[PDB]
Every structure is written in C-alpha cells, then in structure tokens.
Amino acid sequence: MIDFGNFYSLIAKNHLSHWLETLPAQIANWQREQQHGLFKQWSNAVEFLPEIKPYRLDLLHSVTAESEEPLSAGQIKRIETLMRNLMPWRKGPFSLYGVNIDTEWRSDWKWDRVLPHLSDLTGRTILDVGCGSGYHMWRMIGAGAHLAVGIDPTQLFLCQFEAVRKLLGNDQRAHLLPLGIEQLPALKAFDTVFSMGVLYHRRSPLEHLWQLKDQLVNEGELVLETLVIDGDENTVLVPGDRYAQMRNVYFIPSALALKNWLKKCGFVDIRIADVSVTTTEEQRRTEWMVTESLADFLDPHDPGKTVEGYPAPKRAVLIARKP
Ligand SMILES: Nc1ncnc2c1ncn2[C@@H]1O[C@H](C[S@+](CC[C@H]([NH3+])C(=O)[O-])CC(=O)[O-])[C@@H](O)[C@H]1O
C-alpha cells in the first residue's frame, strides 16, 4: 500500500492545508475498496524498481533521465521488464536511463499545442484533472511549476506515476492522488487548473466547469481540452452507446459552444486556442500498448468518421480566467 504521508506532510505546511479535512479520509476509503484483478503485479513493479537519482534530467523538452555512466544490460533489463508490467502505457513518452517508453499517445504533441497559450507556469501550484500516467505534470514542473498535483481514480496510473517518480529520484514536486474530480470540495487554491480529455466523460458538463472553477484562486487560469465537433454556439453532439468505441461519452460540443458554456459558468477572457484532428500518428498501437487504438476506432473506408458513423475525433484547447 502506497504511503501518502509525504504529501500530507507537505500540504500541512502550505496553502493546500485545508484539503486535509477531506483527503485522508477519501484516500483511506479508496485504499480499502482496492483488490484490482492485477494489483499485485503493478505494485510489485513499483517496489522492485531501483530508486535512482538522475544525473541528467530534462523535463523541459521531454521527460528524460540519464546516469553518469551507462547502466548494465542487466540493470536495464530489470527496469524494462518491470515497466513492461505496467502496460498499457497510454500517456507519454518517457525516456529513463535508456528505457524508452513509447506510449499510445504523443502526449508531447498536446503539450506543444498548449504551452504557447499558457500564463507563465513559473512558481505556480497546479491541479491536473484526469492526469493519467502524470506525463504532463512533469512537463509543468519542467516549465517552472512549484507543485503539480494530479488526480486520477485509476489504480494502474497511480502505479505508473510512482514508478516514474522512483526513477526520477523520488522527486517531490509532483503527486498523483487517486480521486475523482467529483470528490473535491471547493479548494480555491490553485493558480492554474488543467482538464484535458475529461469533460466528455462527465454526465453534467456545466457542473464540471463549475467544479474546476471551484479549485482556482481568483485570477487563476483554466486550461480546458476535450473532444469537439464543427459548428456554431448551438451545435452539440451527444452520441449513442459508442463513440470511437468509447462507452460513456456524453457531450461533444463545438468549440464555439464550449466557449459559451464557460461564459455561462462565469469564466472570462475565454479563447479558443487550438483545434486539431487527432491522427493515427498522435494515437496508435506501440510495443508498450498492444490492444486496439485509434485506427481501429475509425471507419475503415473513411477516416473523416468513427466506426459508428460520427465525425472523427477532433480536439480543442480553450483557455480562460476566473475573475
Ligand atoms: N472522475 C474523474 N476524475 C478525474 N479523472 C477521471 C475521471 N474519470 C476518468 N478520468 C480520467 O481521465 C483520463 C482520460 S484521458 C486524458 C489524459 C490526459 N489528461 C490527457 O490530456 O491526455 C482521455 C483522452 O485521452 O481523451 C483517464 O486517465 C481517466 O482515468
């Protein structure tokens, strides 16, 4: 069982301290709920990895760690084998002492779409909602953030993040908590909040936006990214049982529509920063994710479309300020 003492101890002494009124209880419950099918294999992976202080660390242009002298083939195999047990690796990539984890997504491409539109991350305390493996949190550190907190109620992604953290010298500037966004009170304590790929999984989209607002300090920045379709303010798709084979997909608004929803929920200075079709170069099967992926979710004879007939995945980035 993973110990969140470090995190509690950290926030006890800073401006997130009020989170202790709820968090440890929620984490404890989550820890009892847990017997995942494969939980042992995942947590053994983390336990049996070596703690290594990177000699060189790049978080600015990637997430890459190197040692002073190359590791032995056996040291490298031990790492690779153990990381290979945390498959499927979806968000990345990571390059760790020569072990190159090529993840389903080019999460770097998203980061590059986003960065040019952000307020300076330098010194900020940040929340990443549905952070996955935690890739982006490391980039946020790389880009100057003081503290990066992620939440994702998936167990595998917690083990992934802690595996990476161990190999980055047990770095204490990022943390992943296994909560859902629904579980948080109104912390009003983060300078910048990210929600990327989460809105379309929420039954109530406006309440998601209000819940994100509730986590920001005044003058804070929201970074919102999700599936969209083309059209005006009033154009919004709600698909059936499956969209691109995903099961519980609710609102896929246009960017213009989503801009309006943000105004509804009381944000200002709202900008549509980037709109982009997801290509099978951004999302695809790799040696580190070997089940189905985007190519399988598209219409075989028309990539303009999903396998079900809907317009194909298309993603938008919006930035806003909380007044
Ligand atoms: N209730 C929830 N609260 C917080 N997270 C959730 C919740 N439910 C599911 N998620 C998580 O949201 C992530 C979905 S991906 C975005 C990853 C990254 N942010 C990216 O921008 O690529 C989808 C995509 O790639 O479009 C997964 O990690 C889910 O476990």
Numbering used by the authors: 1 to 323
What does the paper say about this structure?
Cx-SAM bound CmoB structures were determined in two crystal forms, resulting in 10 independent copies of the complex (two tetramers in one crystal form, and one dimer in the other), while the apo structure contains a single dimer in the asymmetric unit. Difference Fourier syntheses calculated after initial rounds of refinement, without the inclusion of ligand, exhibited features consistent with the binding of Cx-SAM in the catalytic site. Continued refinement and modeling indicated that Cx-SAM is present at full occupancy and demonstrated similar atomic interactions in all 10 independent catalytic sites in both liganded structures. The side chains of Lys-91, Tyr-200 and Arg-315 interact with the carboxyl group of the S-carboxymethyl moiety of the Cx-SAM ligand. Three additional conserved residues within the CmoB family recognize the amino acid moiety of the ligand: the side chain of Lys-110 (815/818) forms polar interactions with the α-carboxy group, while the backbone carbonyl oxygen atoms of Gly-130 (817/818; the presence of a bulkier side chain would likely interfere with ligand binding) and Met-196 (606/818, where other instances are leucine) interact with the α-amino group of Cx-SAM. The side chain of Glu-182 (96% conservation) forms polar interactions with N6 of the adenine moiety and the side chain of Asp-152 (∼97% conserved in CmoB orthologs, and highly conserved in all members for SAM-dependent methyltransferase superfamily) interacts with the 2′- and 3′-hydroxyls. In contrast, backbone oxygen atoms of Met-196 and Gly-197 of CmoB form potential carbon–oxygen hydrogen bonding interactions with the other two methylene groups adjacent to the sulfonium center of Cx-SAM; these interactions are absent in the CmoA structure. Within the catalytic site of CmoB, Cx-SAM is highly exposed to the bulk solvent, whereas in CmoA it is substantially more buried. In all subunits in both Cx-SAM bound structures, a feature modeled as a phosphate ion is present between two basic residues, Arg-202 and His-208 (98.3 and 67.1% conservation, respectively), with one of the presumed sulfate ions from the crystallization media present at a similar position in the apo structure.
